[PDB]
Amino acid sequence: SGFRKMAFPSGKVEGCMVQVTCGTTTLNGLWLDDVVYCPRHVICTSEDMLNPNYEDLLIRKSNHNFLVQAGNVQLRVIGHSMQNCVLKLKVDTANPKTPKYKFVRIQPGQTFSVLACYNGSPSGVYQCAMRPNFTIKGSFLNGSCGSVGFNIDYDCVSFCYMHHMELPTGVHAGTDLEGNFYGPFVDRQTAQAAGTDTTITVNVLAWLYAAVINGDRWFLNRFTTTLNDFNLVAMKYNYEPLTQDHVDILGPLSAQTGIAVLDMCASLKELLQNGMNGRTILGSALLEDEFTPFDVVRQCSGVT
Amino acid sequence: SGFRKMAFPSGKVEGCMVQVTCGTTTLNGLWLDDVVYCPRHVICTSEDMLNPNYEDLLIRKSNHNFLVQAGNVQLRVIGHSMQNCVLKLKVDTANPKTPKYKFVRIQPGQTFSVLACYNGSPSGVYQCAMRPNFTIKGSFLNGSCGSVGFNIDYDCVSFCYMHHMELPTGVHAGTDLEGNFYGPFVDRQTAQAAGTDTTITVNVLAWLYAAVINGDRWFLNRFTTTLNDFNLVAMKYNYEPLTQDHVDILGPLSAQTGIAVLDMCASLKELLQNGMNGRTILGSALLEDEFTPFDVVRQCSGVT
Ligand SMILES: *CC(=O)N1CCN(c2ccccc2[N+](=O)[O-])CC1
Numbered sequence A, B: 001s002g003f004r005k006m007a008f009p010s011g012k013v014e015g016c017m018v019q020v021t022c023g024t025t026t027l028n029g030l031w032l033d034d035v036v037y038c039p040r041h042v043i044c045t046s047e048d049m050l051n052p053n054y055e056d057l058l059i060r061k062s063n064h065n066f067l068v069q070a071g072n073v074q075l076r077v078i079g080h081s082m083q084n085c086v087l088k089l090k091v092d093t094a095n096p097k098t099p100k101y102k103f104v105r106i107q108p109g110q111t112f113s114v115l116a117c118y119n120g121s122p123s124g125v126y127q128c129a130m131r132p133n134f135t136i137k138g139s140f141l142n143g144s145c146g147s148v149g150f151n152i153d154y155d156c157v158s159f160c161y162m163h164h165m166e167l168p169t170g171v172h173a174g175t176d177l178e179g180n181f182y183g184p185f186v187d188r189q190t191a192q193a194a195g196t197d198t199t200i201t202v203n204v205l206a207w208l209y210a211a212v213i214n215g216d217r218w219f220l221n222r223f224t225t226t227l228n229d230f231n232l233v234a235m236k237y238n239y240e241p242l243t244q245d246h247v248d249i250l251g252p253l254s255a256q257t258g259i260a261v262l263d264m265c266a267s268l269k270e271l272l273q274n275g276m277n278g279r280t281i282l283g284s285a286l287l288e289d290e291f292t293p294f295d296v297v298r299q300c301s302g303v304t
């Protein structure tokens, strides 16, 4: 029993983290096979960062200007290319610690683990969600760029995120491992505002199911509702609209607990309209939205 | 910027986790050098767990009855001894993945990472605190026993916790790596109630300093207080008394922020007396007590 914000074990990713230096800029790269992936802004002076022409900046750079260090051993760079907002550094050695991996571009509301890194060294691991506005609420200082977000399926690491930016409002923006930003963000030091950060409704409901399973039940009520009625309440409180897809995904949690998705929605509706009245749920005073239904099943069943 | 409940990278510990089977009981062991450490209740039938005589049960067990599996390779057990509530299984092979390590018995209020494991396989990592009542608020299912709590200092893993029990109230009890329980708990399926779970006052204050650093400042007030005045409020709200030791430890956070410890105490006092009025602090609706001052410095400076 008990329910915790849980990150994947970080070992398989720790073995991929390297340091990339170009001129005087240092940040993190990801070494998979004979390719090191890093944010392309590794080529920028912070002057460059106001309005960088990456194509023009990168003409000035050769293979030998990319200093790649894995632990205390230097990697020989034999090629470099720009793919969207990342550089791919071809090195002469395949990472012997390359796990099975995929690159996946996640949907908003999906959760992943971040291994926060500085000079290609891990400092810590935490669990995140891709917010509906395609920001993540991270913990990142200068040098953290190139830290990666991931999921693990038994032995296969699915990389979904590379860290690039902090927005002036202290939330985080970044790319898939093809170098495409989540959201409308660019790798430029410019006015970039986040949209409305909506609550991930299906995740809150999964979390309410997690609570019931763990004995926290005070918020179960006598009521039910409809998808249309619930969605009017959701709109008013900046919750994502709930779909029959969301209902379907919550099915096994519904089946395990014997509480109908729409009953649980009616519990959520009352919590939204009445607040928690100073009570807590799984030791939280607000409604948690960074567990997926998959996350709740996994933690509540003990998948390794 | 941003502030997250962050676990140590788990790689160095993942490489130590094994499966221990005795008769039909399976749980996790920790393989360091040529010794596998596991909970001694690995020798129990769940019948045994009502009132086990471990000395008497262990007479019935030989080296070959302890099945130790690391990945899919079996370890040869050449010796077994009971130290307090753990077994030490001497194997014929030193773990090649043994990191630098110590065994440390932590104080209540100190934080550590747990690598939750099942059949010697990692499922996830989260950050915990040793509560003042020597419980931890974990996430553990059947098979999770032998999962370990740790801190990492650059390259040295300090093991502080091995998982043994869930109390009837769904909190967790366990031992240092010498097999001594934290708190008054025994490895027996009996009436065991936790004492008063008090809030770790110095950790809340460290967390308030973390908030200020990250721009969350609304709770800073015009007031100050004294250690004696603050402690009267702390007593009333089941907060640990604050000592000059606690003040000293908060010094660098005080020095970095320019907010006197006793001013911050006066902010905490008002939060205790008035509550949060529906506001949040670092995205929490309650006062977080599972970051140490060391945790706040580390995350806010980017120590690897
Ligand atoms: C996020 C991170 O670690 N990061 C981005 C900012 N950065 C940088 C970019 C261009 C020029 C200089 C610098 N810098 O100040 O180091 C460092 C890496």
Ligand SMILES: *CC(=O)N1CCN(c2ccccc2[N+](=O)[O-])CC1
Pocket: B025, B026, B027, B041, B044, B045, B046, B047, B049, B141, B142, B143, B144, B145, B146, B163, B164, B165
């Ligand atoms: C915590 C854990 O994984 N654990 C403790 C309970 N347990 C056990 C002990 C004695 C006899 C049987 C069993 N069992 O049901 O497996 C399993 C291991």
